Amino acid sequence: SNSIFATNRDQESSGFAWWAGNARLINLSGKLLGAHVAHAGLIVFWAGAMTLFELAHFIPEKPMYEQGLILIPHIATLGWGVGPGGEVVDTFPFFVVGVVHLISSAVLGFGGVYHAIRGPETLEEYSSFFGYDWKDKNKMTTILGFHLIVLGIGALLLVAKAMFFGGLYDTWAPGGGDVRVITNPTLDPRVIFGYLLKSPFGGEGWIVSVNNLEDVVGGHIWIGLICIAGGIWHILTTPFGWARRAFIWSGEAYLSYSLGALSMMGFIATCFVWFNNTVYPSEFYGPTGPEASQAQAMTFLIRDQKLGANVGSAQGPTGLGKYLMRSPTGEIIFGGETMRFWDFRGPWLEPLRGPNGLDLNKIKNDIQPWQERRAAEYMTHAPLGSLNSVGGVATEINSVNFVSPRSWLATSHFVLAFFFLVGHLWHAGRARAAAAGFEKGIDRESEPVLSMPSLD
Amino acid sequence: ERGWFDILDDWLKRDRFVFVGWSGILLFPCAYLALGGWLTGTTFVTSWYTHGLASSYLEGCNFLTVAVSTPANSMGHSLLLLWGPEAQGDFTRWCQLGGLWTFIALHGAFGLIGFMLRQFEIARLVGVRPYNAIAFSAPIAVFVSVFLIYPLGQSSWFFAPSFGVAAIFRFLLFFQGFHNWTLNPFHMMGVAGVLGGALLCAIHGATVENTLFQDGEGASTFRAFNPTQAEETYSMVTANRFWSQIFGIAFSNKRWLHFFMLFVPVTGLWMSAIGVVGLALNLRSYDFISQEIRAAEDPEFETFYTKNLLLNEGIRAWMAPQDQPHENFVFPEEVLPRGNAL
Amino acid sequence: METLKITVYIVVTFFVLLFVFGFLSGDPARNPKRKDL
Amino acid sequence: GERPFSDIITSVRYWVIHSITIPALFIAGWLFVSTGLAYDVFGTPRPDSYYAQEQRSIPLVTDRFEAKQQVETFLEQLK
Amino acid sequence: QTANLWERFCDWITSTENRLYIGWFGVIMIPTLLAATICFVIAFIAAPPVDIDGIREPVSGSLLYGNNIITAAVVPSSNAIGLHLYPIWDAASLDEWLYNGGPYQLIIFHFLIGIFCYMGREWELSYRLGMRPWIPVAFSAPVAAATAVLLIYPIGQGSFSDGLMLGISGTFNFMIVFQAEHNILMHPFHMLGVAGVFGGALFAAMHGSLVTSSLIRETTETESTNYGYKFGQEEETYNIVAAHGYFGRLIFQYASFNNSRSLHFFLAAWPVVGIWFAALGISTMAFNLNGFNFNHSVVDAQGNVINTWADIINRANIGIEVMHERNAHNFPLDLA
Amino acid sequence: AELTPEVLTVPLNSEGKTITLTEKQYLEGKRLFQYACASCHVGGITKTNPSLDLRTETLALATPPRDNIEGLVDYMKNPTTYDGEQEIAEVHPSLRSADIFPKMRNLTEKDLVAIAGHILVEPKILGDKWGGGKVYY
Numbered sequence A: 001s002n003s004i005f006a007t008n009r010d011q012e013s014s015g016f017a018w019w020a021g022n023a024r025l026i027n028l029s030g031k032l033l034g035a036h037v038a039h040a041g042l043i044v045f046w047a048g049a050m051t052l053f054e055l056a057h058f059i060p061e062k063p064m065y066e067q068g069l070i071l072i073p074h075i076a077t078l079g080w081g082v083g084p085g086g087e088v089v090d091t092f093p094f095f096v097v098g099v100v101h102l103i104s105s106a107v108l109g110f111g112g113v114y115h116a117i118r119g120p121e122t123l124e125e126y127s128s129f130f131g132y133d134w135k136d137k138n139k140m141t142t143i144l145g146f147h148l149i150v151l152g153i154g155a156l157l158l159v160a161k162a163m164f165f166g167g168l169y170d171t172w173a174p175g176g177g178d179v180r181v182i183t184n185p186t187l188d189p190r191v192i193f194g195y196l197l198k199s200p201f202g203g204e205g206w207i208v209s210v211n212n213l214e215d216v217v218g219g220h221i222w223i224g225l226i227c228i229a230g231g232i233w234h235i236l237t238t239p240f241g242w243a244r245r246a247f248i249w250s251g252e253a254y255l256s257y258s259l260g261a262l263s264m265m266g267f268i269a270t271c272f273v274w275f276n277n278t279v280y281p282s283e284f285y286g287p288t289g290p291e292a293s294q295a296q297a298m299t300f301l302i303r304d305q306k307l308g309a310n311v312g313s314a315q316g317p318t319g320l321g322k323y324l325m326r327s328p329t330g331e332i333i334f335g336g337e338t339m340r341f342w343d344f345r346g347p348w349l350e351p352l353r354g355p356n357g358l359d360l361n362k363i364k365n366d367i368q369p370w371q372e373r374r375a376a377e378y379m380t381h382a383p384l385g386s387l388n389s390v391g392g393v394a395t396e397i398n399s400v401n402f403v404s405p406r407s408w409l410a411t412s413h414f415v416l417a418f419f420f421l422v423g424h425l426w427h428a429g430r431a432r433a434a435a436a437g438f439e440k441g442i443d444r445e446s447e448p449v450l451s452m453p454s455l456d
Numbered sequence B: 001e002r003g004w005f006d007i008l009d010d011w012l013k014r015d016r017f018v019f020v021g022w023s024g025i026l027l028f029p030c031a032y033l034a035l036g037g038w039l040t041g042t043t044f045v046t047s048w049y050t051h052g053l054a055s056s057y058l059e060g061c062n063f064l065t066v067a068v069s070t071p072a073n074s075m076g077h078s079l080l081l082l083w084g085p086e087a088q089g090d091f092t093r094w095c096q097l098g099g100l101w102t103f104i105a106l107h108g109a110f111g112l113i114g115f116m117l118r119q120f121e122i123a124r125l126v127g128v129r130p131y132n133a134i135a136f137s138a139p140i141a142v143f144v145s146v147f148l149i150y151p152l153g154q155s156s157w158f159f160a161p162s163f164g165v166a167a168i169f170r171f172l173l174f175f176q177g178f179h180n181w182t183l184n185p186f187h188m189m190g191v192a193g194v195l196g197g198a199l200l201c202a203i204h205g206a207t208v209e210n211t212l213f214q215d216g217e218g219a220s221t222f223r224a225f226n227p228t229q230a231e232e233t234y235s236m237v238t239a240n241r242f243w244s245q246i247f248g249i250a251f252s253n254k255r256w257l258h259f260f261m262l263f264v265p266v267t268g269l270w271m272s273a274i275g276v277v278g279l280a281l282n283l284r285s286y287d288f289i290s291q292e293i294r295a296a297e298d299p300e301f302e303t304f305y306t307k308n309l310l311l312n313e314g315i316r317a318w319m320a321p322q323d324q325p326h327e328n329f330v331f332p333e334e335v336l337p338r339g340n341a342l
Numbered sequence C: 001m002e003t004l005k006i007t008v009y010i011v012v013t014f015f016v017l018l019f020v021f022g023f024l025s026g027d028p029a030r031n032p033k034r035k036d037l
Numbered sequence D: 001g002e003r004p005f006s007d008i009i010t011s012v013r014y015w016v017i018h019s020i021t022i023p024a025l026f027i028a029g030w031l032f033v034s035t036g037l038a039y040d041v042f043g044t045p046r047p048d049s050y051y052a053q054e055q056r057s058i059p060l061v062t063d064r065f066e067a068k069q070q071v072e073t074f075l076e077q078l079k
Numbered sequence E: 001q002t003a004n005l006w007e008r009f010c011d012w013i014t015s016t017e018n019r020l021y022i023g024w025f026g027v028i029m030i031p032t033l034l035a036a037t038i039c040f041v042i043a044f045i046a047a048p049p050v051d052i053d054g055i056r057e058p059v060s061g062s063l064l065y066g067n068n069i070i071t072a073a074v075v076p077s078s079n080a081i082g083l084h085l086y087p088i089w090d091a092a093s094l095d096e097w098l099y100n101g102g103p104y105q106l107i108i109f110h111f112l113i114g115i116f117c118y119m120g121r122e123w124e125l126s127y128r129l130g131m132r133p134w135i136p137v138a139f140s141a142p143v144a145a146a147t148a149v150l151l152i153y154p155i156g157q158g159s160f161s162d163g164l165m166l167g168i169s170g171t172f173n174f175m176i177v178f179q180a181e182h183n184i185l186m187h188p189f190h191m192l193g194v195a196g197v198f199g200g201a202l203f204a205a206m207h208g209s210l211v212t213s214s215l216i217r218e219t220t221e222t223e224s225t226n227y228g229y230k231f232g233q234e235e236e237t238y239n240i241v242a243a244h245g246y247f248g249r250l251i252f253q254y255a256s257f258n259n260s261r262s263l264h265f266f267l268a269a270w271p272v273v274g275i276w277f278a279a280l281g282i283s284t285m286a287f288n289l290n291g292f293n294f295n296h297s298v299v300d301a302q303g304n305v306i307n308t309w310a311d312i313i314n315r316a317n318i319g320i321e322v323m324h325e326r327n328a329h330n331f332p333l334d335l336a
Numbered sequence F: 001a002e003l004t005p006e007v008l009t010v011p012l013n014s015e016g017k018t019i020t021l022t023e024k025q026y027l028e029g030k031r032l033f034q035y036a037c038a039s040c041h042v043g044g045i046t047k048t049n050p051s052l053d054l055r056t057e058t059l060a061l062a063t064p065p066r067d068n069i070e071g072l073v074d075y076m077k078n079p080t081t082y083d084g085e086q087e088i089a090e091v092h093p094s095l096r097s098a099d100i101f102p103k104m105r106n107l108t109e110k111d112l113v114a115i116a117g118h119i120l121v122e123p124k125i126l127g128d129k130w131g132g133g134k135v136y137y
């Protein structure tokens, strides 16, 4: 009664110290449900509260990327609130997204707190549907299937937005970036799955190279159907013998598999926001590193050519062209250190590119002021800056309060992906050792090495 | 009738929360003044008159940029005593002249002596061998060579390290640009001892923790240990087999293992101290003569060694006017070495 | 160069297949304790 | 042989004493700065006292034994 | 039978009786580490100069081409290649491949695969031996650091020509340029790294000295005290209560470990976490989120900058910046 | 040293008329300069064209003269090349091109005067460091 150890919420009952206390939940399906739903509330809370904070701080006439925004860029990329060139025409859609997430987080938090402290601690006595045993392989694949179906619907919501509810922001739209309705999504599997077999190295870039919204939307049509089909599959089947023999079947093992999965996705997202300027439009996120470096070469090409330079024939100090040179396969590219960035592609630059690379005739005659503007802007918003948000190279003096959203998003998600790989190793190794029965140490009376022949 | 010395010895060595000892008579005042001097200086004291630098919270610096900075080069190696001929008893002028630097360096030195003496004294009273004291000789060699011998070989205390986070980073880059200190094999042995010591720390802790015997039922395994137990808490035999098969060799002797954990970082720090003693005299490992002969004759010959000297030349030319203000360097823009565009 | 490329592709494929089929071959049961895994 | 810190800092007597002494020390340190006394004890320039209005040169000490009088001269050139 | 012959192979691969454990991770580790080592040794001795910065300015890295052990390196692939994969079979000739820094890519990619498999192999053998599984978690710290400087940093900057150069002086070149371009000394993750390795060395010496200090007398005055411990003996070889009694008096009682399991967890955790943060420092400065910038942070009443030590660091950084790769920049900002 | 009325007194026009800025004016000018200009003109240089800086002596030799409030205010409405021959509002932020440089959209006459006063006062404080670049950091 009046005893501190009288509950099962201590090391004495559970075998786990307070600093591993959430492991006490492994076999308490009800409270563990509470923990998960409450945690979902925290995610949704942040999405809502952070959007309202961003909107309250938002000056619509400054670029988003001058304002430390990462969520409003996500909403704008879906075509909400913006017009030609990414200009903000209406902030109310940002407000709605923020409010509805914040209100929804209250419902999730309510259910989480209920299940965590007031509801039934285990679900199995209460419901055969919601109860589960981690070692019940069929129940596990059924719950996986439910969530696969939910994820497929989610992918089809993006498609629905792109095709029937206003479209998406298209940085590549002919005549300038603009919101565009996608009517011909790419369904050809040779294109969609071709992305998955591209090398991740330079000039290829695996799926990070996706460069048009038709492929994006068609890809999500495929992922939607694949996930719904796989979900139906896993509700109607149980694991084959070869799978049963290959895997560890425990809650901690399943957690470890998902940690390895999320780590991989985190590293992928890091590269996506660093290199891709289609689903991360530079109008909202700022230029990529490659983009800003190319924009500097473009800027001084324009300036020096205006002064009378023949930029095609100008030999730089090394013997390579000061402004223009060849890639290792012959394409005409910008010179200087930005020779490394010749795989870059962006809508302000492509009008100057022909079958042989950069076209000297177009460079001499057809560079428009909006291209000079965009190159100057992007050169001066390169994703370089200090931890206290002093923009520029590390030797820059204080003045410009700037760190690119691309740098914030790349660094955070590398840090997170890395620790999640560590978590995968931790929990995968522990799940193996626990399934085999030696996660608490070596049995003194049955030490395996003592029964092995010496090595020499 | 015992005798006042023995009665004092009794009281000094009483088993209390903070052991005092004879060594504490030296240790506690000198450690307290060194620490108190650093906190006082970094909170309130400028470096305007010695360095042309702000250096305190009072002036607007933060924890990374505050320092107690060295005296001006014109002070030479003056002890800079409060009552000495420079400050002449004026506490305010003493602070403005940099007296807190020698205050901290000298009380710090005698405090470190007091601490090593404490290690000896406690070991003798408890009855253990004084290896902890012996290992501490490495921190002492580093402090003495870096904060005392190095400036004593140079023109003045000005070129000792200043006591601050960013000030120390400046000291690192100064040693790169002027001494090419990374090229010095005594620094390299120091690096090996520090990184090798950290490696030994990690691998030994990890090995013990993953060869534990199951001595309890808890999934958290810390509770299954008793300090008075006779038995090893982990399997040396299983650990030895694991590393033998993974890496090719393994410890088999626990005593050697733990001596080696002392030997590696202690020896490394001792070697780095020797190199700094050379740098006190500008006896640098600055160049490889054969490389310079070849590069001077052959303008197509380039190595990472010649590339780093160009960086050093940049460090010296661009940092010296503000870093050595007593020299009154004026380097017109046209003489500054620099590559294309930058 | 083309012969080298094919050779390396085969070599890489060979070792990767050994790794995948190896770890598929009932690896949980290859431990000194509970082998009914 | 002395009382554990956890007994001391969870006692009413400890907090009666230190509810006075800790704020008092905090306020005295505050005033040490806000009255400007910290500047004059340690000889730290106020924001308007690093340079005279016309010159933009550092008052660096160059004389070991008359450094005290040299600082005193650099300070008289401010006002 | 195929299934029997394959099971015999699996039993040999995973055998706890091989002098060096092979295992399934070892099936990948052994060929990749051999390829990387052989290429590295040959290149370090004999490779001709390499145009690291893509400006037709080849840097000599090998011993036979005028280097010693301290200056030699295997030089990164050309800036003209950037992040493109440059295998031997994409070159017109070995001569071209060598000029452009082909060996570097072969070495680093085989090495990285090899050390990741080395880490998995540490998990694997621990599983075969009935050990607990987290030694590879400790090794993940150096693996993460190697991956940061050989893979993540060049990806972020768009070129393997900016990855760690494989030699002693090449390492220093990488470090000095990095300081100018990221102010890594002013980055808190590098500071945590330093605490990790300074603290790891300190705690190694501390732990080593305390155990050595309290060895139980088991030898005569002639022989090494090391003979007082016999491999595999059941009893502890030092008096941990004596060791704790010393260290608790050296500082104070509750600052000292009496639990050997807690003590050894701390010894593992401190350097490992420190190096995790070091690796994350490089891996996030790879995307140009750089060290603290307090350049001109202190300003007087009129508006004059009052320099701090941060500003003196900045002057050294500028000197490095303007001099490095002195023929490679044509435009005013070094943006990668 | 202090930010005095004398330091804050700058040429209003080429004819020799002066204006004494308030401390609030100067601070507003500094803030607005950071908001709209420092991405290219930090420290008095010009990142996208380093040949032209914001030094008073450079502004004095521009056509029309830009070393005074009215000259700088006019420049922020209708910028020209250094010789005055060509209008460059299409590639330089100005009130005339506030449609394509949206950070100019809400700037009042008072705001332009403040920005102009910051540009003229700053070299009076910093000397050759204004427009000096990294050599003077």
Ligand code: CLA
Residues within 6 Å of the ligand: A008, A009, A010, A017, A018, A019, A020, A021, A022, A023, A024, A025, A028, A031, A032, A034, A035, A036, A038, A039, A106, A109, A110, A113, A116, A117
């Ligand atoms: C995402 C964060 C998170 C979540 C969702 C949980 C959830 C849970 N934890 Mg874990 N825990 C966490 C982080 C988390 N924890 C961390 C960081 C640590 C290390 C300190 C631990 C250490 C730990 C231990 C040692 C134990 C748990 C236990 C539990 C479970 C029972 C809690 C209980 O009985 O408290 C009772 C507490 C109260 C009744 C106080 C009030 C608690 C409520 C929930 C606060 C709600 C606040 C919110 C603003 C209300 C909004 C209302 C509105 C929506 C209407 C529960 C499912 C226990 C368990 O496993 O039980 C079987 C257990 O023994 N946790």
Ligand code: CLA
Residues within 6 Å of the ligand: A053, A054, A057, A067, A068, A069, A070, A387, A389, A405, A408, A409, A412, A413, A415, A419, E273
């Ligand atoms: C994906 C995560 C993420 C990213 C990329 C960003 C990015 C940004 N934020 Mg947001 N934010 C986040 C999550 C994130 N935030 C969360 C969780 C909160 C709730 C606290 C907020 C609340 C918030 C506010 C209130 C504000 C921002 C602002 C910003 C901008 C300025 C950032 C800054 O100065 O940081 C400074 C950097 C630090 C403080 C460094 C933190 C270092 C951590 C502690 C390292 C942790 C390592 C790892 C996680 C732990 C490992 C431990 C190990 C033992 C396992 C930048 C765009 C600012 C803005 O400009 O808005 C318009 C702003 O005012 N954010």
Ligand code: CLA
Residues within 6 Å of the ligand: A033, A037, A107, A108, A110, A111, A112, A114, A115, A119, A120, A123, A126, A127, A130
């Ligand atoms: C995945 C999350 C999840 C899961 C698996 C459960 C599961 C359960 N809940 Mg809990 N709960 C949750 C979230 C969840 N809940 C949330 C968010 C709240 C706050 C509203 C609650 C508040 C709550 C209370 C107050 C009670 C339960 C109870 C129960 C048990 C009986 C439920 C039942 O029979 O419904 C039958 C099914 C229906 C009535 C139809 C549900 C249709 C829903 C409302 C709409 C679905 C639309 C769509 C899928 C939602 C997407 C949301 C997404 C955008 C985030 C069962 C174990 C009961 C219990 O434990 O009794 C002992 C109980 O009294 N839940």
Ligand code: CLA
Residues within 6 Å of the ligand: A141, A144, A148, A196, A197, A226, A227, A228, A229, A230, A231, A233, A234, A237, A238, A239, A240, A243, C020
């Ligand atoms: C959340 C997603 C998810 C999860 C966790 C599972 C989990 C499972 N699936 Mg299901 N599946 C899913 C989605 C999912 N599935 C979807 C959406 C579909 C429809 C396409 C299916 C269709 C499906 C079938 C037909 C089968 C499974 C089966 C299984 C079981 C064993 C699978 C296995 O061995 O994987 C590990 C994968 C391998 C062993 C194959 C080799 C893997 C290579 C070497 C890895 C290469 C990865 C590469 C580097 C990363 C991307 C690059 C690439 C694009 C080039 C396991 C319970 C099996 C089962 O028994 O079900 C009853 C089974 O037969 N699934």
Ligand code: CLA
Residues within 6 Å of the ligand: B025, B026, B027, B029, B030, B033, B079, B080, B081, B082, B083, B099, B102, B103, B104, B106, B107, B110
């Ligand atoms: C462990 C105690 C201790 C030690 C070793 C030191 C050491 C030092 N102090 Mg610190 N100090 C201390 C405690 C200590 N201090 C305390 C408690 C305070 C606060 C009051 C200070 C406040 C302080 C200040 C303000 C300063 C110092 C300074 C110094 C340095 C110069 C000291 C000096 O020249 O003394 C000289 C005096 C002696 C050596 C006394 C020796 C007495 C002899 C042995 C008597 C011999 C008698 C003989 C046998 C009789 C013969 C008779 C005949 C007729 C036969 C030196 C590093 C100075 C400094 O750091 O400058 C940078 C400085 O300015 N100290």
Ligand SMILES: CC1=C(/C=C/C(C)=C/C=C/C(C)=C/C=C/C=C(C)/C=C/C=C(C)/C=C/C2=C(C)CCCC2(C)C)C(C)(C)CCC1
Residues within 6 Å of the ligand: A034, A035, A038, A039, A041, A042, A045, A052, A099, A102, A103, A105, A106, A108, A109, A110, A112, A113, A116
């Ligand atoms: C279990 C547990 C836990 C956790 C918990 C959690 C995590 C919870 C969550 C919770 C939640 C998640 C909650 C939420 C809530 C929310 C709300 C309550 C909201 C509201 C809103 C509002 C009210 C709004 C308003 C508005 C509008 C409408 C408009 C705009 C403006 C404003 C904003 C004003 C812990 C850790 C403690 C531990 C112990 C156990």
Ligand SMILES: CC1=C(/C=C/C(C)=C/C=C/C(C)=C/C=C/C=C(C)/C=C/C=C(C)/C=C/C2=C(C)CCCC2(C)C)C(C)(C)CCC1
Residues within 6 Å of the ligand: A191, A192, A193, A195, A196, A207, A210, A215, A216, A217, A218, A219, A220, A222, A223, A246, C019, C020, C021, C023, C024
């Ligand atoms: C949306 C989109 C798209 C599409 C996409 C897709 C269609 C995707 C798919 C994807 C996929 C389809 C994926 C998959 C993956 C897989 C995986 C990831 C696997 C893994 C595996 C594992 C992990 C295994 C392991 C193992 C081994 C190896 C040995 C034995 C044992 C075990 C089993 C453990 C695109 C790009 C067009 C564009 C953009 C948008």
Ligand SMILES: CC1=C(/C=C/C(C)=C/C=C/C(C)=C/C=C/C=C(C)/C=C/C=C(C)/C=C/C2=C(C)CCCC2(C)C)C(C)(C)CCC1
Residues within 6 Å of the ligand: B032, B033, B035, B036, B037, B038, B039, B040, B103
């Ligand atoms: C010099 C001198 C002297 C002495 C003085 C003294 C002895 C002083 C002391 C002083 C002191 C003794 C002071 C103190 C201070 C303190 C402070 C200022 C603190 C702060 C802290 C904090 C801020 C914290 C932080 C943190 C950490 C660190 C970690 C965890 C987290 C946290 C955040 C909590 C005499 C008179 C003899 C003579 C003349 C000269």
Ligand SMILES: CCCCCCCCCCCCO[C@@H]1O[C@H](CO)[C@@H](O[C@H]2O[C@H](CO)[C@@H](O)[C@H](O)[C@H]2O)[C@H](O)[C@H]1O
Residues within 6 Å of the ligand: A241, A242, A245, C021, C024, C025, C026, E003, E004, E006, E007
């Ligand atoms: C994303 C790409 C997806 C591509 C499609 C992937 C399909 C994967 C099919 C997996 C087939 C598994 O095939 C599996 O191989 C080996 C072959 O000995 C068997 O492994 C067997 O090895 C030995 C006997 O030799 C036994 O000790 C072990 O218990 C047993 O499992 C599995 O029992 C068999 O089922």
Ligand SMILES: CCCCCCCS[C@@H]1O[C@H](CO)[C@@H](O)[C@H](O)[C@H]1O
Residues within 6 Å of the ligand: F012, F013, F014, F015, F064, F065, F066, F067, F068, F070, F071, F072, F074
């Ligand atoms: C109409 C009378 C002529 C004198 C008054 C009008 C021009 S005044 C003139 O304004 C210019 C910017 O517009 C500046 O270049 C110049 O310095 C300023 O004096």
Ligand SMILES: [Ca+2]
Residues within 6 Å of the ligand: A005, A006, A007, A008, A009, A010, A012, A013
């Ligand atoms: Ca209990």
Ligand SMILES: [Cl-]
Residues within 6 Å of the ligand: B307, E173, E177, E323, E324, E325, E326
């Ligand atoms: Cl270089």
Ligand SMILES: [Cl-]
Residues within 6 Å of the ligand: A335, A336, A337, A338, E328, E329, E330, E331
């Ligand atoms: Cl360039």
Ligand SMILES: [Fe+2]
Residues within 6 Å of the ligand: B204, B208, B258, E207, E211, E264
């Ligand atoms: Fe040990």
